[PDB]
Design a binder for this molecule. Structure first.
Ligand SMILES: NC(=O)c1csc([C@@H]2O[C@H](COP(=O)(O)CP(=O)(O)OC[C@H]3O[C@@H](n4cnc5c(N)ncnc54)[C@H](O)[C@@H]3O)[C@@H](O)[C@H]2O)n1
Ligand SMILES: Nc1ncnc2c1ncn2[C@@H]1O[C@H](COP(=O)(O)OP(=O)(O)OP(=O)(O)O)[C@@H](O)[C@H]1O
Ligand SMILES: C/C1=C/C(=O)O[C@@H]2C[C@@H](CC[C@H](C)/C=C/C=C/CC1)O[C@@](O)([C@@H]1CSC(=O)N1)C2
Ligand SMILES: [Ca+2]
Lengths: 413, 360
């Protein structure tokens, strides 16, 4: 009955429903065959479907296409963006606080009551963290009250941007909203609220946009070249000579010199004078926008060996152990740090088990190295040595029989 | 007069005259200075004490031009014994050689050694050519690096080239490692050359690594004897194949990269689908490190098991293999129709060093 919905329906279930049905009717009429069919498969099987869309991009390209589940993903993706929003909107869903890297427990099932203690902990575990968000999910258009399901004590109030794709669809008797998460989320403010005489945490979240090419290494390359082609040259007469040093086939000399501290223990101006430039090579054209990149990392970077038993993530204790040790913490890299713009696996590191997913703020030290020709063919972004990264979150997925880690991180500097 | 083929690897240099069927000059790619001031080749191993050994080529890319120079110099005069000026010169180069090296190879060859003509061919290509083909996939594995190099119609395909920093050098170190874990001790830089020899004499790839392990652990039949320079004898067992196994399972050596069979399928798969058929049926193996008995049959198995069951798989691995990049060099350089393809000094002296960019 609104002619144009408000930006936030707040507690007003009845109007939100009245507007979304009208909208669900419209939009469904615009789906094609494959799209509807996709929707019809989501309803019947949404958990397994969402799971797939969370961790879809980490396999080899050919493992991605050859997936019986990828057909459906692509179709549901298309469906979702078919209808991009109007203008911004606010949505409501519940999370598990696990999701935010709070592995403890707000207050259990039967308590209707939330510790000031636990509450402050939470506020602390999520303040100044971005948390990357991926995969399909159902969201609601108004705040829950008496009558609505309320499965967790954690309630997320999210402001979707002007252009988000959003699918309102009928399912038996109610109206549901489908979205594809693709951004990271900052929590600005969390407050305690009550509903049906019960206590719940309410998180105010906003989207910080970063570019993320995931498996579309092509899309990525175009971007990369679009920024780093005039850089290939621009880099001046003495940095030009120096640049072609890490990018001279062998890096286990230039890193290995930085790892076990060469600088102020072992000084060797034959590489220092190399570095003070190979560093300014990256500082030539700093990153032109918030960019996600992917590093596949090996056991050393996390104080283990190939053979360490605490590296077997097929056993959850080791995950739980890994998380205690790393989640929340900020790690520093003495090495130039070598990432790719695309999440796909590859022969050079086919078997590495720690994926580092890095959000890089706009304006930071780096470069699309893969913009030189010849050298060309792995979509590499180099990050400046002495970089520090904040590990906000540890996820995991099965890759074949081998379990791996996805570390959601932000480059602080 | 008669052309020249000089194949520059990270361990060995293979060098000779076009049209012969084997390199006359085969010698180590090392330059020695001390703490009077320059030594190359063998009479730099000889020397090892007074001087410090550098390998000018690292992982098949040229990393110190000043030493290459010495290398190339020794080659012409101390080795082949001719003069840069009387002979044209074919040179090889690793895949994904950056534009500047190629460029710098030119000047130095012209503006220093002063050669009427020269050419530069990618290594894997020549190696494919020596076996009569011009489309197919080369596993080229040398002393410091191995490459899966998919080629169609004479052109290497860079997007799909697969590179792997793990070769015979590393396979020797590991042989040194696990031999030591056994009783024996290997320590010097001149004691290594001994294991290197064992490796070449005694290792072999197992058709099926587990059955090898178990046959090894439960009987004596697999155990070869080696005879040290003077007197003593070492005995070697499952090391005999644990070593080249690394190739299929780099984890052996603490690397988490894919192995030889997987990077082949990987490289094939980054290629246009229409051509995959021909890659599979034209898998040519080349390089010192491909010389393990058993290697062809294992590739053929590990590959068979990754590719579509309808696929036809062929693993070509001639005995002349170790020196094939050279041979294809000599074939190429001796060919009547090729003569109008060199880059001549008049070609260089005039138009720039940017000429070498010979994508046909
Ligand atoms: N790893 C990737 O996601 C990625 C993207 S592009 C890419 C390219 O592939 C090739 C392989 O790169 P790479 O991964 O070896 C680069 P790196 O040299 O960082 O890694 C080499 C090895 O050393 C260990 N190591 C690395 N950094 C540290 C550290 N700070 N502290 C302790 N141990 C460490 C690693 O676990 C690994 O075993 C390079 O040419 C690179 O350009 N790798
Ligand atoms: N029978 C053999 N079995 C295993 N390895 C061998 C054998 N003969 C030689 N090799 C190894 O081959 C390597 C040298 O081969 P090759 O000359 O093709 O490499 P390169 O061209 O010197 O260096 P690269 O090819 O890596 O640039 C050495 O490591 C050597 O020990
Ligand atoms: C003519 C000849 C060549 C040869 O055997 O190959 C080479 C020779 C070697 C250079 C070291 C000293 C100068 C030479 C010793 C030569 C002895 C006579 C045999 O570089 C290798 O050692 C590399 C390094 S470590 C390894 O595993 N490969 C393989
Ligand atoms: Ca070689």
């Amino acid at each position: 009955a609104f002619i144009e919905r408000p930006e936030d329906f707040l507690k007003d279930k009845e109007n939100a429903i009245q507007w979304e049905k009208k909208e669900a009717e419209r939009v469904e009429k615009n789906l094609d065959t494959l799209e509807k069919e996709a929707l019809e498969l989501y309803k019947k099987d949404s958990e397994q479907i969402s799971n797939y869309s969370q961790t879809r991009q980490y396999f080899y390209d050919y493992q991605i296409e050859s997936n019986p589940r990828e057909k459906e993903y692509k179709n549901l993706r298309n469906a979702i963006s078919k209808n991009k929003i109007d203008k911004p909107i606010n949505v409501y869903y519940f999370e598990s606080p696990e999701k935010f890297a709070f592995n403890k427990e707000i207050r259990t099932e039967n308590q209707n009551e939330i510790s000031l203690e636990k509450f402050n902990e939470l506020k602390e575990t999520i303040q100044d963290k971005l948390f990357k968000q991926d995969g399909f999910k159902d969201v609601s258009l108004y705040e829950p009250g008496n009558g609505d399901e309320k499965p967790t004590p954690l309630l997320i109030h999210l402001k979707l941007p002007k252009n988000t794709g959003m699918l309102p669809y009928i399912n038996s008797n109610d109206v549901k909203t489908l979205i594809e998460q693709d951004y990271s989320i900052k929590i600005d403010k969390i407050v305690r609220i009550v509903i049906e005489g019960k206590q719940y945490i309410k998180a105010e979240a906003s989207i910080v946009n970063s570019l993320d090419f995931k498996d579309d290494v092509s899309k990525g390359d175009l971007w990369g070249k679009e920024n780093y082609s005039d850089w290939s040259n621009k880099l001046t007469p003495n940095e030009l000579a120096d640049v072609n040093d890490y990018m001279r086939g062998g890096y286990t000399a230039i890193n290995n010199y930085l790892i076990s501290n060469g600088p102020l223990n072992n000084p060797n101006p034959e590489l220092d004078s190399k570095v003070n430039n190979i560093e300014n090579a990256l500082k030539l054209t700093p990153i032109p926008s918030n960019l996600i990149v992917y590093r596949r990392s090996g056991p050393q970077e996390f104080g283990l060996t190939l053979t360490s038993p605490e590296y077997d993530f097929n056993k959850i204790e080791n995950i739980d152990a890994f998380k205690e040790k790393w989640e929340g913490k900020v790690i520093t890299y003495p090495n130039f740090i070598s990432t790719s713009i695309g999440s796909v696996n590859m022969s050079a590191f086919a078997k590495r088990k720690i994926i580092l997913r890095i959000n890089i703020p706009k304006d930071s030290p780096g470069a699309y190295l893969s913009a030189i020709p010849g050298y060309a063919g792995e979509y590499e972004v180099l990050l400046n040595h002495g970089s520090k990264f904040k590990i906000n979150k540890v996820d995991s997925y099965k890759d074949g029989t081998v379990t791996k880690l996805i570390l959601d991180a932000t480059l602080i500097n | 007069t008669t052309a020249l083929v000089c194949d520059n690897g990270s361990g060995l240099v293979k060098a000779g005259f076009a049209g012969d069927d084997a390199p006359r000059a085969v010698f180590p790619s090392i330059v020695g200075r001390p703490r009077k001031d320059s030594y190359v080749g063998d009479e730099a191993q000889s020397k090892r004490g007074i001087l410090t050994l550098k390998y000018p080529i690292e992982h098949g890319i040229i990393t110190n031009w000043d030493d290459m120079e010495k290398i190339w110099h020794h080659t012409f005069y101390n080795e082949l014994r001719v003069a840069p000026e009387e002979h044209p010169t074919l040179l090889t180069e690793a895949p994904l050689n950056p534009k500047a090296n190629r460029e710098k190879m030119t000047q130095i060859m012209f503006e220093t050694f002063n050669v009427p003509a020269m050419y530069v061919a990618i290594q894997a290509v020549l190696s494919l050519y020596a076996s009569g083909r011009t489309t197919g996939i080369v596993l080229d594995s040398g002393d410091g690096v191995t490459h899966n190099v998919p080629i169609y119609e004479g052109y290497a395909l860079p997007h799909a080239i697969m590179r792997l920093d793990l070769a015979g050098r590393d396979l020797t170190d590991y042989l040194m490692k696990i031999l030591t874990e056994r009783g024996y001790s290997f320590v010097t830089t001149a004691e290594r050359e001994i294991v290197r020899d064992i490796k070449e004499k005694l290792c072999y790839v197992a058709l099926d690594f587990e059955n090898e392990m178990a046959t090894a652990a439960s009987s004596s039949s697999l155990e070869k004897s080696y005879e040290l320079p003077d007197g003593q004898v070492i005995t070697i067992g499952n090391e005999r194949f644990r070593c080249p196994e690394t190739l299929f399972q780099p984890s052996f050596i603490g690397m988490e990269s894919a192995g030889i069979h997987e990077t082949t399928y990987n490289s094939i798969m980054k290629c246009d689908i229409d051509i995959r058929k021909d890659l599979y049926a034209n898998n040519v193996m080349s390089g010192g490190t491909t010389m393990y008995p058993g290697i062809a049959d294992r590739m053929q198995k590990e590959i068979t098991a990754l590719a579509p069951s309808t696929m036809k798989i062929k693993i070509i691995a001639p005995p002349e293999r170790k020196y094939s990049v050279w041979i294809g060099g000599s074939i190429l350089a001796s060919l009547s129709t090729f003569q109008q393809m060199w880059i001549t000094k008049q070609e260089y002296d005039e138009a720039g060093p940017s000429i070498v960019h010979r994508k046909c």
